[PDB]
């Protein structure tokens, strides 16, 4: 949270990556943006959360750096 929302990401980019497994799922993102904080602001982050797995959805997780990226993204800008 604040600026150290970035240690945050990188830390459930340790939780959600197991130790060493850097993919992690949509399913990974609901416990997230559920357990992980609370919640961003509702719709927007809506799209975080949606926009994670991708076009097929059979196996599309997200590794090392979107889930990072996009965190830095949603929360900084």
Same mark, same amino acid.
């Given at each position: 949270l604040g600026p150290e929302e970035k240690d945050e990401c990188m830390k459930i980019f340790d939780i959600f990556d197991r130790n060493a497994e850097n993919i992690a799922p949509v399913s990974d993102t609901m416990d997230m943006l559920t357990k992980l904080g609370q919640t961003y602001t509702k719709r927007e982050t809506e799209a975080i959360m949606k926009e994670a797995? &991708?076009? #097929? &959805?059979?196996? #599309?997780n997200i590794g090392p750096e979107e889930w990072l990226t996009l965190c830095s993204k949603w929360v900084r800008q």
């Open positions: 797995r &991708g076009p #097929k &959805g059979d196996k #599309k």
